[model samples]
Target: MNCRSEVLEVSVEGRQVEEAMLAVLHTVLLHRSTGKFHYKKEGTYSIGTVGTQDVDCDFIDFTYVRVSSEELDRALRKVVGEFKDALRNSGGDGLGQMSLEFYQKKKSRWPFSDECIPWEVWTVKVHVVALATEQERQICREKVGEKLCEKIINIVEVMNRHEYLPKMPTQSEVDNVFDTGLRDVQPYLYKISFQITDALGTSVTTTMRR
Candidate 1:
């Protein structure tokens, strides 16, 4: 078997271990409203001279960040506890981690402003890795890509519904909502991998190399 030196590698590192712990608070808040936990996903964009779709080198390079997990849990607990009080003071139900702004966005049906996005620090997460191979690693790419997409969709949905009406779903309600007698109403994301590979008997390791 020929050795393929070019393999795409992707990594995700949580920055501000303390901050990543906030994810737990975020999750708890989301479940309080929707009975579900969500993950943040990745996004893609092209960088170039404006109209041109030329890729940017900075965007192409692999990205990574570092953080501790213990700090993350502590921060999440504190934030959630504080937000829970705010809700009570505002003459609303007592639910920790529920933010008024989150509700306002949902009511107005407005998209989130980038600045409102949370960040523990300027640290980064190593998101994407692509290797050079004679043939395209479509399977590997799709697997990782889909996982990232799922996280993204989950996060977006949670943020969108952060202040949603307190309408809890019954087990029957969840089970009955389906297609062709199959429960299909569960929200989710779909991902597809765009890649190519070489199948020649040559020892070429890069699929990108023609």
Candidate 2:
């Protein structure tokens, strides 16, 4: 994609990070006017556009960075600082606004071009809210086991296909790994309820800003 600005501002309170992240992903996938769904990794998701000669717009990608609970107050201060900077540099009403930039190489190149000269620039605005949990935290740990097990199976299959180990493991071997890994990690996972709002894009921007 060429240079553009897109915002995915989500307001998540009392929700697990996984659940909140998925909600945002689902919203973007459903509402995007262009671009096809791409893969999602641990902290990143992307959508690629179908090229047309008429428009210069390209793909959009989303990234999630961990926010520390201990330093959340400091993080909020940093966000305010950047918001002020964005307003000053870009000439806008800076209130409750934040900005970030991304650069990525294009998937296709011009004919006879030895290197891909085209690149995309993206600007993102983010908002965050964390709320206290009401549900028992232990229940959250137990519920995540199933999802983690599924992810483990997929990871093992890919690793086996790429010959990451000396020999391809059987389904039983993968299951065993899932069982062991989930047992160790489940206790650490957080649990929270997720709610999806009707507002999208700019409609919810004001709410997120608060």
Candidate 3:
């Protein structure tokens, strides 16, 4: 059966572009809570959030960041350009090795705070959804869910890559980081419903068989 995927919603908030992106990625990947917070460096500053769960698939919902329209547009174009390059270099081999290397290169190039564009704090939101047949859902659930989720997270990592001073902290250290910044922000949520239609203008419904 024919199947497809699309983003349904997304949300984000932070003083820095990187932090806002990180928040959006974590929400989409984890599907647990919204408006979560993260911290790094000394206790004086805040960073990002943690992603829970290990299911894999490539459905990313939404992303938000604090950057000007020009900067955001440029960054998105860069990502698309890199994606095309990966596809071109892979030929018939698919985006296996080429994609890995591409992300790693991008990760290495992640900006330091000083290198980032200055912008006012803003919140971003996104939503994502997938459409599949019963057979496809079964196959994905049993065999490939985790891997797909990992792929999605990998893409997010590439997009939000950043450098840290001192050293990257252990998982425990990240968990212990404070949530003061998150708590200080006002809680905001919005929802909108829409339909997905085929080229013929027929509405599509996604189903999974248990």
Candidate 4:
């Protein structure tokens, strides 16, 4: 499968970890997820309005939109919070990563279970800079926001290019590609995960050759 993937790297103080992560995470979601989903047991589905809220980051000068659903927002925040918590206990590497992926499920060819295939992936690589003075920390906040705004715009450009996406499913198979669990914003099934890289560098594929 051909997957559309992008990597966004940003530098910020430790305290701004969560805020920076949320700003990037929510931007991807705003583009990928939309419309309230209504479903019945027989695989019937329809879409209505998906409420959205404009959010301003407390620690940064960036702003993003979020789906106005408590459950979905809380679940996403939980992932970002956990990554911040893990980074706190980490050593002086001062580097962390968060990845979000959108996938669809395909039925089994035999008696096996369905399969989840990722169609789009976005990775946020964070270089946690250590700031000593109040002025430096304050300055870092604005710079991080400026950097994020650029990256967010890059994200928009990539999405607007009209790249390939999964084909629309038939009415009976609507739930296969989209997650019907949430009352608002039926996104393709998504997963967010974190990693602590050993170095602030490119990925294994880029540097290594067969």
Name the best candidate (by lDDT): 4
In model 3, where do residues sit more than 4 Å from their true spots? 1-138, 162-195, 199-210
Ranking by TM-score: 4, 3, 2, 1
For candidate 4, what's the RMSD? 5.7
- After superposing candidate 1 on the true structure, give the runs of residues whose Cα lies further than 4 Å from its correct spot: 1-124, 127-130, 161-210
lDDT of 2 by residue, 145-208 (tens): 3443343344334323432111222333322111112211111111112222222312111111
Candidate 4: clashing pairs of residues: none
List TM-scores for all candidates, in order. 0.20, 0.21, 0.23, 0.86
- How many Å off is the CA of 146 in candidate 4? 1.2
The residue ranges of model 2 lying beyond 4 angstroms of the native Cα positions read: 14-16, 27-126, 133-210
Residue 173, candidate 2: alpha-carbon lDDT: 30
List candidate 4 stretches off by more than 4 Å.
Answer: 39-45, 198-210
Clash count (model 3, backbone only): 22
For each candidate, the alpha-carbon lDDT, in order, equals 0.26, 0.28, 0.28, 0.76
Sliding window of 10 residues with minimal summed lDDT for model 3: 97-106
N/CA/C clash count, model 4: 0
lDDT of 3: 0.28
- Candidate 3 lDDT over residue span 108-145, tens digit each: 24464212111111222221223246554454343333
Tens digits of per-residue lDDT, candidate 4, 1-210, equal 578888888888888898888878877777887575566676676778878898888878778777787777877778788888766556657877888888887887888788878988889888887678989888977888888888888888887774777787766676677776776667777878787755443222111001
